Amino acid sequence: XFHXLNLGYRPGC
Amino acid sequence: XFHXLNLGYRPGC
Amino acid sequence: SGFRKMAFPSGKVEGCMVQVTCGTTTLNGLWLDDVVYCPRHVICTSEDMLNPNYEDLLIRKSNHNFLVQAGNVQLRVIGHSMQNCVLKLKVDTANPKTPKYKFVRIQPGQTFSVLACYNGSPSGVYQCAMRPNFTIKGSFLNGSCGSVGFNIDYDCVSFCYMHHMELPTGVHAGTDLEGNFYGPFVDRQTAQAAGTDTTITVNVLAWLYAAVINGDRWFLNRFTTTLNDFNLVAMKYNYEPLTQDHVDILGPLSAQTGIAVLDMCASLKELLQNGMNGRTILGSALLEDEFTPFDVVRQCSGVTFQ
Amino acid sequence: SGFRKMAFPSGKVEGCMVQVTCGTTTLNGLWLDDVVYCPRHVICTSEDMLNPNYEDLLIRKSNHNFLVQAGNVQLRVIGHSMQNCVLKLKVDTANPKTPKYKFVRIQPGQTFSVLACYNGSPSGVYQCAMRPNFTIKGSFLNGSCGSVGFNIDYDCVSFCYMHHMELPTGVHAGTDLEGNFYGPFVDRQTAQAAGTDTTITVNVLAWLYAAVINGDRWFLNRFTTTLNDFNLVAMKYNYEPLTQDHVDILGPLSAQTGIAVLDMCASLKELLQNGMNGRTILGSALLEDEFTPFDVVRQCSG
Incomplete structure (x- = not known):
């Protein structure tokens, strides 16, 4: 997901 | 040899 | 060397x-x-x-x-x-x-440098390629959004990538500096995945020329294949088709080494079919596809920037 | 990732x-x-x-x-x-x-960035390691003398290498910024050669931790080893001895991954004895030894 802290990026999707 | 163009550097020595 | x-x-x-x-x-x-x-x-x-x-x-x-x-x-x-x-x-x-700068939208197979940043502070620099599937195999942590990819010619910076996101396979997607994504990706939280990728044939050939220039010749074979015969084998190993345009682009490296492009194709064909057999090429046990013909010439000839 | x-x-x-x-x-x-x-x-x-x-x-x-x-x-x-x-x-x-700068003389196994230059003009930047034989595997053409190697911490540049010469095998030798050569090399036109090199064990271990951090575990196993037993196997494959200091240095990566250093040593031992068998680690078919534990922590964390 997005590489901007609280926008929900999760390694592996 | 030396990486300075008149000083006789030859690839492979 | x-x-x-x-x-x-x-x-x-x-x-x-x-x-x-x-x-x-x-x-x-x-x-x-x-x-x-x-x-x-x-x-x-x-x-x-x-x-x-x-x-x-x-x-x-x-x-x-x-x-x-x-x-x-x-x-x-x-x-x-x-x-x-x-x-x-x-x-x-x-x-x-x-x-001095411009914004340029690059084609798949082209390489660029990435300046990875966090909190507006530069962290590191590395070299990448736009993959055929329009992702890049980058190195980016959360916070890296807005880091850019670029090339330099003499004194002019051509910006080609701004980082936006990571895909489930750990590869990266982003836009040109005018905000158009590379590939079909969108800046919405919805299921997205990298397509099947392929190997950038012209770049592997360029890297094999780099190897020859640096004295690494064990893989050479002079049974000159045809473009058609080569592409048949390429298809099988998930390599991009090689066009006459690619052959032309490899011209200077061919001339410098005196090895016809189709002879290097014959060598690559053999490498694909038999593997490297425990040997390395430029210290690598795998065929490398993130050097363009331009990259090879620049690094082997000592081109500088202002 | x-x-x-x-x-x-x-x-x-x-x-x-x-x-x-x-x-x-x-x-x-x-x-x-x-x-x-x-x-x-x-x-x-x-x-x-x-x-x-x-x-x-x-x-x-x-x-x-x-x-x-x-x-x-x-x-x-x-x-x-x-x-x-x-x-x-x-x-x-x-x-x-x-x-802000300092000059530092590095140890073998330490990595640094090189800014290759010609005629006072930057050509490119790449990362390398001081090999155990005190050469570096660089990329330098005639004219590159005086190009430097460096590390940066916050705003401070630690210069550690100035380029002088290439050896017959195509590897490179040079000095610290106070002009002392790394290794036995001299700035005289006389026969010189790189010695037999070894693999930087602590760095390979670090890179294996990098692999785990990035989600790959295939090379792990259920076994442990002792430092002594590990070094016996290392010696045989031309790997540098691993010291307790190296084990301590790997502490943070161990803690982060929950894999004891001696457990990762057991994995490396198995990799040395059996090979990778056509599998890759972080896109590499060879064990990589030019990332320090600090490099791994810098790149994988932050």
Whole structure:
């Protein structure tokens, strides 16, 4: 997901 | 040899 | 001698990196003249990302909602607009370190340097390629959004990539500096995945020329294949078809080494069919495809920048 | 995610690069404050290189024999001295782009960025390691002398390498910024060769931790080893001994991954004995030894 802290990026999707 | 163009550097020595 | 994955000197780009904050979201921006460029999702909360109407969301923002920091100095935002998936923030001060620059949308197979940044601060530099499936095999942590990819010719920086996202396989997707994504990706929180990738044949051939230039010739064989015969074998190993245009592009390296492009194709064919048999090429046990013919010539000839 | 051979941003160093000419010899120099640093063989002709007495050769030079160019501006040399194998040229202008810096002599196994230059102009940046045999696997053409290697911590540039020469095998040798060679090499035209090299064990372990951090576990196993037993196997594959200091250094990566250092050693041991069997680790078909534990922590964390 997005590489901007609280926008929900999760390694592996 | 030396990486300075008149000083006789030859690839492979 | 020696042949290394090599990046462009990053100084010209370092002087352009800033931090952009909107509400609770912070990422990197690129400050050129009196404009700061950054991924438009800076204006979003997690809720917004499910189905963002960016036009609607941006209209709800004022200039003062954007905090832009260069070093330890706050730049005054005096305008804002959106261009595709990038936000442009007009600031009241032109960046005095602005290099000569252009924005260019690259083709798959082209390489570029990435200056990875966090909180507007440059962290590292590495060399990447735009993969045939329009992703890049980068190295990016959360916070890296707005880091850019670039090439340099003499004194001119060609910006070609702004980082936006990571895909489930750990590869990366982003836009050109005018905010158009490479590939089919979108800046919305919805299921997305990298397509099947292929190997960049012309680049492998270029790297084999690099190997010869550096004295590594064990893989050479002079049973000159045809383009058609080669592409038959390429298809089988998930290599991109080689065109006459690629052959032309390999011209200079061919002339420098005196090895016909179709002879190098014969060598690659054999390598694909038999493997490397415990041997290495330029210290690598795998065929490398992230050097372009241009990269090879630049590194082997000592081209410099102003 | 992702894992790349990664260099420090080179801007702080680019602002220090100059061209130094004496007679017919031109190479790169490093301009910090009011001093320019460069390989002392700048003062030599090919005749001189056979058996140079640099003290004797330098005494025959004046300040005005040295032409220093920054961009397209000539800096006035107002003093000169030799320190080991580096020449120091005092110039009448302090470099306004001088970063915070120090000079440090590194140990084998430590990595650094190289800014390759020609005629005082940056060509490219890449990452390398000081090999156990005190060479580096660089990329340098004739003219690259005086290019430097460095690390950056916050805003401080630690310069650790100045480039002097290439050996028959195509690897590279040079000095620290105080002109002391890494390894037994000398700045004289005489037969020299790289010694047999070894693999930097602590770094391979670090890179295996990088692999785990990035989600790959295929090479792990249920076994442990002792340091002694591990080093017995290491010796056999031409790996450097792993010390308790190395084990301590790997502490943070161990804690982060929950894999005991000696457990990762058991995995490496198995990898050495059985090979990778056509599998890859972080896109590599060989065990990589040019990432330090610090490099891994810097790139994988933050």
